[PDB]
Write a protein that binds this ligand. Structure first.
Ligand SMILES: Cc1ccc2c(c1)C(=O)[C@@]1(O)CCN(c3ccccc3)C1=N2
Ligand SMILES: [Mg+2]
Length: 690
């Protein structure tokens, strides 16, 4: 049994290594220690001092510099006896405080033990390096083993959820939290690998091949993650009454399609673009009129076209192979790349001013190239771009857009093409994975993590609000409902205020009465004369000096701050109305509806992809679509028994072996980890009726 064999990889990679006789001597010591702040200004930088004396209400200890300080016992962060250093479940620590919890994670992290239990939930610190703990041999070890019988691991919590699904005949859910780059997507994959194995000969393989496809079109390099998921997703692993995998369903959420036409410095567009250009055959390059990434406006503005340690040519091959195993016709696959190539050409179209204010198109090389691969008439497309037709009452009037507006319309077409292609890809995949009515399922949530950039827009607000909601879901299940049970069954429990509540922030963003940020956003979206300026003025009017989670900065007139659980974020109001309205000239849709290409035709004719719901007189806004998907997720989660995994980023440099206290402690605090451990200790978790 590898579990009890100190020579097995299991012991080598999942257990804390045996300490020596020298460590043993320190472990049996009678001395007592305390964690203190050498600098009262740097509260997260701790040192270990020895307690030399005490009074009825205080300790006197020695600092590293051989000095002496005193502290009241009530404010003291005592250090746990070192026999606890490396403990697998921190609910066991005698002293539960920030430096103690951080120290234990540090001790384990220093030995590449990234998983640690914090009572009922799992904590996972991103190693930013490969660790051999995800092999089939590792999967077999955890199979059917109780949590307390094996080391902490993403596989263990997956197995527990699986057993609970069978033991209770209840749908389960794995909620993996974390800011951008913390490890959510990596762990999500592990969960699926493990379940596919223990409950699994072709379906399971296709289920696995679904990710590399989604990531190529849905992931991209941002300043916080080289493989940032730019769309969130809820994955349903479906099982039959017997407990066998009967299928899988992928619920994808809104994609950051604005990235296709713009990327901040040092970031990249979606991976696929680089994979195609770098992995396409010499013939494909001629047929699609491809060239180097530096040749395309949509790829040569960030100053970055490659990711260290990543081969786009090699990744392309993996994507293609994934597309094959899932079942994408060689025809479909080619159309997909034509769309990708077409998008690139569209981005190269340079509009110029004519004799008048209207724009003209002198060079038509790119226009012609795009029309070619897309299978649409270039003259038509050209007219639909610079001279779209609209109704002026009931009259049909041909517009003549200037350079700026022509460019924006061109970007709108691009974003719609990509966003729809993504929906199409997910749809196709679900057809293959969905072929049997399920009896149960385990849902794995992998949303885009909390993120902050120099410039935060509408997308970031929605992303961070999602993270705000998931954290509230954790607070609710861990603290609210927990104590609600105690007081319901009344076991002489006095309510405890854990101080974790994101309701105020949530109300500020999605509140109905009074109306929140999104509500006002939509309101301004229908107001015929509204501008981004009138929008922010409206927001300031409602929340400046009125909502404690809102801030009207004195240093800017185009930004507003929102205090999230993970920190305050300043949002730039530029383009919010257009992003929310998400317009597209009908003449462009008519142009592509007549495309000779099958995939393209499907993207503009398939209602469930091309159609857009109407909020009465206007088309449903993106904020409205957002709210709908969120509500849908929350409702689903309510029909499941949740399991939480808290992913923790070690630093902000994507470097291994570099655990920074400040970075880690802020996450431990806003995640409610210690409070989570305290409720498990002070309360009564498991309880069965008579
Ligand atoms: C349940 C839910 C609801 C809405 C969401 C998400 C998840 C995401 O993570 C998304 O994919 C992540 C990015 N995103 C988004 C981006 C731009 C505009 C609107 C939404 C998302 N919104
Ligand atoms: Mg991710």
């Amino acid at each position: 049994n590898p579990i009890h064999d100190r020579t097995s990889d299991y012991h080598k990679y999942l257990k804390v290594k045996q300490g020596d006789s020298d460590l043993f001597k320190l472990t049996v010591s009678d001395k007592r220690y305390i964690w203190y702040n050498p600098d009262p200004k740097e509260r997260d930088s701790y040192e270990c001092g020895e307690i030399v004396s005490e009074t009825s209400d205080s300790f006197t200890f020695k600092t590293v510099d051989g000095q002496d300080r005193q502290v009241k016992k009530d404010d003291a962060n005592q250090r746990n006896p070192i026999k606890f250093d490396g403990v697998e479940d921190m609910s066991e620590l005698s002293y539960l405080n920030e430096p103690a919890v951080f120290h234990n994670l540090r001790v384990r992290y220093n030995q590449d033990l990234i998983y640690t239990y914090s009572g009922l939930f799992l904590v996972a610190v991103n190693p930013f390096k490969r660790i051999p703990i995800y092999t089939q041999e590792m999967v077999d070890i955890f199979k059917g083993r109780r949590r307390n019988e094996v080391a902490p691991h993403i596989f263990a919590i997956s197995d527990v959820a699986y057993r609970s699904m069978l033991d209770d005949r209840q749908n389960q859910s794995l909620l993996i939290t974390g800011e951008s780059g913390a490890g959510k997507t990596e762990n999500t994959k592990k969960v699926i690998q493990y379940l596919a194995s223990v409950a699994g000969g072709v379906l399971e393989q296709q289920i696995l091949q679904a990710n590399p496809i989604l990531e190529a079109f849905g992931n991209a390099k941002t300043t916080r993650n080289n493989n940032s998921s730019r769309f969130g997703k809820f994955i349903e692993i479906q099982f039959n009454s017997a407990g066998f995998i009967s299928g899988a369903s992928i619920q994808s959420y809104l994609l950051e399609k604005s990235r296709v036409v713009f990327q901040s410095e040092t970031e990249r567009n979606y991976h696929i673009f680089y994979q195609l250009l770098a992995g396409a055959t010499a013939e494909e390059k001629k047929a699609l009129h491809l060239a180097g990434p530096e040749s395309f406006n949509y790829l040569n503005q960030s100053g970055c076209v490659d990711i260290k340690g990543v081969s786009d040519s090699e990744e392309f091959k993996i994507t293609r192979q994934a597309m094959d195993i899932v079942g994408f016709s060689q025809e479909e696959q080619m159309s997909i790349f034509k769309i990708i190539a077409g998008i690139l050409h569209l981005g190269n179209i340079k509009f110029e001013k004519g004799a008048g204010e209207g724009a003209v198109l002198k060079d038509k090389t790119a226009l012609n190239a795009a029309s070619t691969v897309f299978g649409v008439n270039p003259s038509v497309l050209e007219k639909a771009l610079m001279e779209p037709r609209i109704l002026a009452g009931r009259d049909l009037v041909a517009q003549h857009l200037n350079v700026e507006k022509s460019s924006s319309s061109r970007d709108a077409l691009v974003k719609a093409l990509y966003g729809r292609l993504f929906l199409w890809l997910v749809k196709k995949i679900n057809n293959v994975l969905c072929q049997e009515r399920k009896a149960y399922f385990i849902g794995v949530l992998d949303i885009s993590g909390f993120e902050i950039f120099k410039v935060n827009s509408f997308e970031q607000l929605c992303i961070n609000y999602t993270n705000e909601k998931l954290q509230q879901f954790f607070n609710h299940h861990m603290f609210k409902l927990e104590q609600e049970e105690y007081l319901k069954e009344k076991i002489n429990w006095t309510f405890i205020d854990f101080g974790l509540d994101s309701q105020a922030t949530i109300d500020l963003i999605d509140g109905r009465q009074p109306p929140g940020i999104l509500a006002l956003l939509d309101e301004q979206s229908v107001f015929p004369n509204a501008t981004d300026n009138t929008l922010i003025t409206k927001l300031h009017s409602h929340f400046s000096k009125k909502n404690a989670k809102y801030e009207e900065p004195r240093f800017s007139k185009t930004e507003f701050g929102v205090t999230h659980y993970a920190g305050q974020v300043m949002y730039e109001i530029q383009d919010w109305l257009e992003k929310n309205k998400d317009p597209l000239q009908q003449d462009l849709e008519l142009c592509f509806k007549d495309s000779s290409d099958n995939v393209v035709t499907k993207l503009f004719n398939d209602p469930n992809i091309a159609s857009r719901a109407k909020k009465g007189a206007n088309f449903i806004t993106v904020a409205a679509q957002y709210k709908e998907q969120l509500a849908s997720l929350m409702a689903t989660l309510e029909t499941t028994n949740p399991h939480f995994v808290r992913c923790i980023i070690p630093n902000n440099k994507q470097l291994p072996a570099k655990l920074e206290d400040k970075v880690v402690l802020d996450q431990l605090r806003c995640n409610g980890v210690l409070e989570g451990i305290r409720i498990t200790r002070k309360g009564f978790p498991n309880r069965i009726i008579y």
